[PDB]
Symmetry: D2
C-alpha cells in the first residue's frame, strides 16, 4: 500500500544498541491492529544512519518475517553514493518488500542532474517500486518539482516522501506527474494540510505512538471530511511538534518506552538519551493526545 | 603541519572511477614543490562520500607512500555513526599520518551534547591529533563555539576546520580555547578574512590548482602582511567562487585536468561531469589567476 | 465584500508621477466589468510607500468616487508609527470605504505585544472593518497566528491578508479565530493552494491585468471545483511569478500599459522603469495567459 | 568626525512621548566627557520611525544646540521615497550638522539600480556628506558591494554604516572604493571584528551606556591593538547581544534610565515597555560591563 498512514517505524534496541526482536514484534502487532497501512523499515526514524548495511538488512528481513503478510513493508534504501544505493537495494530484490524509500544523496550536494542520474540508475537496477525522499534540512540538497516530474517518467519510480514542510510543492509536483504518482508527506505537523492539497498520505513519526488516531485521520482525509480530520490533528499537534523537541528518534523512542511498546529507549551515538526536560515535554504531548 | 595552506586534495580517477596512482603522484610532487603545508587525503574534495572505507584507506596509504615523508598527510575519518568513525580511525594507527579531519555527523542532526560525545569517544580511542570539521550546509547540523570549547579540553582535539563562511566564529571559538588550538578556514572565498581575524590557515580547494599563490598568501597572512596577501587573494577570488559553480569537486577536477595535472576529470555518481557553461566560467577564473 | 478576487490596484500615474484620473477610471470600469469583488486602494501595489498621506487620501477618494457604488473599495492605511496609522485611518472615517488594509509596522520590528497594541489602538479609533496585513520580507517582522487569534477578539478586526507564501498559516490561524474571520492570500502564486486549505480569497497583483480569469478562478475555488480552478491557475502561473521579476509594481504597471489599461507605466523613485529583459519576460507571461 | 565610536543616541522622552530636553542634555554632556567621536541624531535607535519629520528636525536642532560645538552631529535623513529623503535633507542645510546617515528604502524593496538612483539624487541636492546605511533585517533589501562602489564615485557619498553583521562585506566594499571612503559597523556584537578586518569605526547602540569603554576600544582597534580591544569587547559582549533581547531601543532606553542618564524609558508605539525578564537580562549585562 502507498496511501493512508505509513509508519516510519523505530528500530527498537536493547541496552547494547542491537535490535530487540520482542519489542519490534510488539510494534508490528500494534500497527496491524491499529489500521496502519504500511511500515517503512530502517528509514530515518529507524536510525538508518547508525546501522551498517548488514544490520540494516537484518532489521528489514526480521520486520518482514514478523509482519507475516499482514501489513506491507517498505525498505529504506538511501545512500549518498549511487553504487552503494544500488547494492543496498539489491539485498532486497525478491525479498517480499513492496517497495523502497530512497533519499537524495546527503552531504555531497549533487546538482539536479546528479539526482536524476542517481535515482534513474537505482530504478534501472531493480524491479521494486521506488519512493523518492526529499528532506533538505538533513541532506543539504533539494529535489525540486521539475526533477521529480522528470524521474516520474521512469516506470519504476512511483512516488515521493516530501519532508520539506513546504506545502506549495504538493501541487507543483502534481502538475508534472500522472494521477498514479503518489504524494506522501514526510512532515507530521503539516501532513493533514498536505493531504487536503491533494496528497495521498503520510510517512509518519507520530504514527509510532498514535497509530489508531493517525490511521483514522488519513481515512477521514481521503474521504474529504477534513473538518473531522482536524479534530484528531489538534489532539495530535503537540505530539507532531514535541517529538522533534530533541533530534528524532530520541523523543519517539522514549514515548514508545513510556507506552510499553518497547522494552528500552536505547539509541546509537551520536543520538543521545532524552533530557529530563524532554521527558516532561513529551509526556505532556502524550497526555494531550489521550494516550498516557 | 596544521598551519598555512593545507590542500583538500582531489582523489584523481581513471574513466572507471578508480584511483589513478600516476595522477595522484603528479599532484603530490606539485604540492611538495609549491610549498603546501600539508595534504588532507579523502576529505570532501577527495570524494569521501563515494569511496567505501576500504578504498578510502587505500587512497590514504597510497598518498602516504607517494608523499614519502616530504609533506605531512591528514586523513579524513568522518562518519555519521560514532562507532563507525572510531573504527575508520583505527585503520590509520601507526600509518604515518599526522592527524585526522573528522566531520560533524551528517543527516542524523545530533544535539550539541551528541556532538560532544561523538568527538570525545573518537578522541579517546586514538593517539592521533583530531581536527573537528563543521560544515552545516552539507550536514544539517552546526557545531557551536561553546561545544568547540568543551571539546578543546580533550588533549587530543587540537583544532577545527570551520567551513561556515561565518567569520564571527573565529573570535568566538578563539576566546574559549587555548592559544595552541588551531583555527583553519574551510571556505576559500572568506579564508583570508578568517586568518586576518586570527585564523592560522585554510584547508583549501583552490590550493589544488593555485598551490604556490595560496602558500605565499597564507604566509603573508601569518606575518600580518594582509594588504600584500589581499592582492594575491583578489586574483584567486574568481577561483574561490567558481570552483563551486557546480558541486565540489566537479569544477576543481576539471581544472586539474585542464592544467595537465591529472589524466581524467572523472568523478563517481552522484557527481556528474562539468557542463559547458561551467567549463567556460572555470577557465575564465583560471586565466584571472594567471594559470593558463 | 471580503471574498473572491480582490485587486490591489495600481495607482496609475502620468509622466510627472501624479495620479492619472483617466487611467484610474479605465481600470475601475474594467474591474466592474470583470467581476472583481473589491478594490484595495493605495496598497503596496498602489505605491503606498512613495505617496504622502494627502496624495494617498486623494487617490482613495478619487477611486471611491469613480467606483460610484459599483464595487467596494478598501483603503490601505498602514503606518509603522501607531499614531500615524490612527491619523491616516481617520481621514477615511465616514467616507464610503468598506474597510481598511493595515500592515504590520515595517522597519522598527515590534514584538508580538507591540503588534497587538498597534492594531488594537487602530481598531479602537475607528468603526471601519480592519484587515491585518503580514508580509515579513518587506517589513522585517512576522505577525504570528497566536497574535492574530488574540487580535480577532477585537470586534472591529475581521481578517488578514497573509502574504508570507507559507501555507501552513491558513489552518493555524483558522483554529484560533471564528468562522466569520476572513483569510486572504497576499501571494498570487500560492493563492489557489491557500483557498483550497480554507482561505476565502486573495488580494492580488495578477488581477490588475487578468481580472476576469482571477474572478473566475476564485469562484470555482469557493464552489469546490479545484481541478477546474487549476487550469486557470496554470495559465496565470507565469504571470503570478514574472510580475515580481522586477520589484512590484514595476512589472504590473508595464503590463497595464501594454494592455492599454493605463496611459503610462511611470513610477516614483526608488522604483525604476522596467528593464528591456523585464519587458520580454512579462510580455511572454501575458502571451501564456492569452491576453496579449 | 566619521571614525571611532559614534553613538546612535536615543531620543529620550517624557511620559507622553515628547523629547525630554534635560535628559538629552545629560546624554550629550556624557558623550562629550566620555570621548565619543560623534552623535547620530534620530537614527534607528533614536526612533526615526515614530517621529514625524517636524519632530525629527526639532530633535536634531536641539541636539546641535546642546552639543554647542563640542561634538559633531550626524542627522538621520532616511526615507523610502526619494523625493521625501531629498526634502528631509533640505531641512538640515546650513544647520551645523557634519553629515547625513541615509538608509536604503525600506518596505518597497527596490532593485540595486533603484538604490543607485535613490542615493545619487539625494547626494546631488546637498553639499552635506552622505553615509549610506544598509540593514536588510529591517528594510527588506540589501545594498550590495558593487552598488556601494558605484555610489562611492559620487564626491558627496563618503561612507557606509554596514549593519548586516556579515563581515565578508568589509573587504568586498573596501577593494571597490577609495582609501578615503569610511566603513562603519552598525552591528555592535561584530563591530570589533569589522574594524579588525579594515573598518574605521562603529555607529553604536552600546555606546549609549558604555561610551568610555567603546571609545577606548575603537582607538585601540585603529592602532592595531586588537587583543587589548578584545578584552574590553569581551566585557561589553553581553550588552552587545542583550540590548537586542527586545526590539531596539527598548532595552537601551531602560538601561539609560537605570544608570540615571535619562528621566524616563518611555517609547512610542509600536515599541512597548521592557518586560521583567528583559529587565533582569539587561541588568546582568550592565553589571558584566562594570556599569552598576
Amino acid at each position: 500500500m502507498f496511501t493512508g498512514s505509513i509508519v516510519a517505524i523505530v528500530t527498537p534496541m536493547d541496552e547494547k544498541g542491537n535490535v530487540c526482536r520482542a519489542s519490534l514484534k510488539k510494534l508490528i502487532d500494534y500497527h496491524v491492529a491499529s489500521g496502519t497501512s504500511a511500515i517503512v523499515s530502517v528509514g530515518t526514524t529507524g536510525e538508518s544512519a547508525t546501522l551498517n548495511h548488514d544490520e540494516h538488512a537484518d532489521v528489514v528481513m526480521m520486520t518482514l518475517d514478523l509482519a507475516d503478510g499482514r501489513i506491507p513493508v517498505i525498505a529504506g534504501t538511501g545512500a549518498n553514493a549511487t553504487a552503494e544505493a544500488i547494492s543496498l537495494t539489491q539485498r532486497f530484490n525478491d525479498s517480499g518488500i513492496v517497495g523502497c524509500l530512497t533519499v537524495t544523496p546527503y552531504f555531497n550536494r549533487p546538482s539536479q542532474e546528479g539526482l536524476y542520474q542517481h535515482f534513474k540508475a537505482i530504478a534501472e537496477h531493480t524491479d521494486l517500486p521506488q519512493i523518492l525522499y526529499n528532506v533538505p534540512s538533513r541532506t543539504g540538497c533539494d529535489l525540486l518539482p521539475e526533477t521529480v516530474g522528470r524521474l516520474a517518467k521512469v516506470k519504476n519510480i512511483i512516488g515521493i516522501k516530501e519532508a520539506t514542510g513546504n506545502l506549495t510543492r504538493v501541487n507543483q509536483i502534481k502538475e508534472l506527474v500522472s494521477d498514479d504518482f503518489v504524494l506522501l508527506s514526510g512532515d507530521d505537523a503539516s501532513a493533514l494540510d498536505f493531504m487536503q492539497l491533494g496528497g495521498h498520505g503520510v510517512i509518519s513519526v507520530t504514527a509510532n505512538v498514535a497509530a489508531r488516531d493517525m490511521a483514522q485521520m488519513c481515512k477521514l482525509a481521503a474521504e474529504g471530511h477534513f473538518a473531522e480530520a482536524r479534530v484528531i490533528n489538534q489532539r495530535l499537534m503537540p505530539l507532531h511538534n514535541k517529538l522533534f523537541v530533541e533530534p528524532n528518534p530520541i523523543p519517539v523512542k522514549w514515548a514508545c518506552k513510556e507506552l510499553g511498546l518497547v522494552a528500552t529507549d536505547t539509541l546509537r551515538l551520536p543520538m543521545t538519551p532524552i533530557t529530563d526536560s524532554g521527558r516532561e515535554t513529551v509526556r505532556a504531548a502524550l497526555k494531550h493526545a489521550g494516550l498516557l
